Amino acid sequence: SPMFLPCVLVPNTRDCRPLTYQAAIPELRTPEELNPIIVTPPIQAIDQDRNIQPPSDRPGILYSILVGTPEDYPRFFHMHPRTAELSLLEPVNRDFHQKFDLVIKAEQDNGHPLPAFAGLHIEILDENNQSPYFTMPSYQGYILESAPVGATISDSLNLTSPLRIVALDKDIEDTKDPELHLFLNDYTSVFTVTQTGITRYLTLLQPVDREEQQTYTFSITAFDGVQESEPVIVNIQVMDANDNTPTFPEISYDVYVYTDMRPGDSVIQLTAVDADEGSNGEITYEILVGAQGDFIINKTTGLITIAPGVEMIVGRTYALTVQAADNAPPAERRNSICTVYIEVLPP
Numbered sequence: 406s407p408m409f410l411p412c413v414l415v416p417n418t419r420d421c422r423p424l425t426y427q428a429a430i431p432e433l434r435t436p437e438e439l440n441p442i443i444v445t446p447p448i449q450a451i452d453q454d455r456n457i458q459p460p461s462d463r464p465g466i467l468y469s470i471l472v473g474t475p476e477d478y479p480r481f482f483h484m485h486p487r488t489a490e491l492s493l494l495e496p497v498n499r500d501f502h503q504k505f506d507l508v509i510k511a512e513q514d515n516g517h518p519l520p521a522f523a524g525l526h527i528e529i530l531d532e533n534n535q536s537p538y539f540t541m542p543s544y545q546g547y548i549l550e551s552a553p554v555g556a557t558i559s560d561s562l563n564l565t566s567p568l569r570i571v572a573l574d575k576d577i578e579d580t581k582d583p584e585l586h587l588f589l590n591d592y593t594s595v596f597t598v599t600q601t602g603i604t605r606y607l608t609l610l611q612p613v614d615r616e617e618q619q620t621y622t623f624s625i626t627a628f629d630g631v632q633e634s635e636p637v638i639v640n641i642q643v644m645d646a647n648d649n650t651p652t653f654p655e656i657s658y659d660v661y662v663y664t665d666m667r668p669g670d671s672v673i674q675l676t677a678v679d680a681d682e683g684s685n686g687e688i689t690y691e692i693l694v695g696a697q698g699d700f701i702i703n704k705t706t707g708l709i710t711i712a713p714g715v716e717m718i719v720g721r722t723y724a725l726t727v728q729a730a731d732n733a734p735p736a737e738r739r740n741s742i743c744t745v746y747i748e749v750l751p752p
């Protein structure tokens with residue numbers, strides 16, 4: 406006799422469409438967090454005649470859950486008899502409960518129950534409740550300092566394959582992009598990470614200079630819109646290019662020697678500078694021409710001395726063209742020239 410609202414007319418008839426009220430419940434959230442459970446549309450039954458006039462208070466209607474499936478619903482739900490307010494009693498685990506289908510009873514309390522019934526369907530919702538994660542505990546990358554902007558960080562010294570950063574999330578099914586946001590905690594003006602895909606890569610925003618900074622250490626944090634991952638730590642090694650030339654302090658050197666000096670005496674100590682790494686910075690000194698057999702230089706020290714079995718003479722002048730070269734492979738080798746002007750003087 407009472408009718409649930411709304412009465413949706415069945416066209417070409419005078420009948421109300423049977424109602425199935427709808428509710429949805431986020432898995433694992435507490436009654437405190439969720440109550441009261443919002444029902445769409447709101448549950449409500451009214452009386453037909455007499456109540457042609459303003460009902461105001463005291464509807465005289467009692468609500469209850471008549472029956473439901475699965476049968477443990479009483480464990481999770483309670484309905485208030487007068488207000489039909491739906492209360493969750495315990496958090497719901499979707500692994501065990503995906504849905505409930507209940508039957509709602511509405512009857513009068515005057516002693517003459519003429520029950521009415523309606524459906525109530527309750528979905529248990531999956532939620533973004535798993536933190537994203539990286540599939541490696543850390544990441545080691547390599548980049549050649551001569552790499553241009555846009556270059557991809559490599560995962561080995563060979564620089565043959567890109568550094569792969571895989572960020573997953575258990576809320577997202579396999580082989581599907583979890584659409585995570587990745588935060589870098591440092592060097593965001595130097596490196597950037599690709600912004601889509603299950604596998605991410607690191608590329609250069611700015612060129613890097615090994616001679617300026619040879620290593621970068623920072624951490625990446627994934628974010629799914631709700632929870633962050635643990636930060637994962639990253640080290641990037643900048644690899645040396647032979648992009649520095651062995652350099653003398655000056656273009657030419659004026660030096661005087663003396664007649665009483667003999668084989669094995671320091672004439673001048675030349676020192677060139679190469680900031681590159683290892684053999685790329687390893688300098689070799691050579692007199693190309695001009696010594697006339699009277700002077701030699703130490704290949705590794707750069708010290709010029711008197712040649713063996715050689716005696717100075719008073720007026721003699723020399724123009725030594727001295728080369729400093731690094732020990733990179735010939736294809737990448739760099740060098741520069743210093744001219745040493747030597748003049749013999751009396752003591």
Ligand SMILES: [Ca+2]
Nearest residue numbers: 532533534576
């Ligand atoms: Ca989930």
Ligand SMILES: [Ca+2]
Nearest residue numbers: 535574576629
């Ligand atoms: Ca998630």
Ligand SMILES: [Ca+2]
Nearest residue numbers: 614615616648
């Ligand atoms: Ca450099």
Ligand SMILES: [Ca+2]
Nearest residue numbers: 649681685731
């Ligand atoms: Ca060099």
Ligand SMILES: [Ca+2]
Nearest residue numbers: 645646648681
């Ligand atoms: Ca270099």
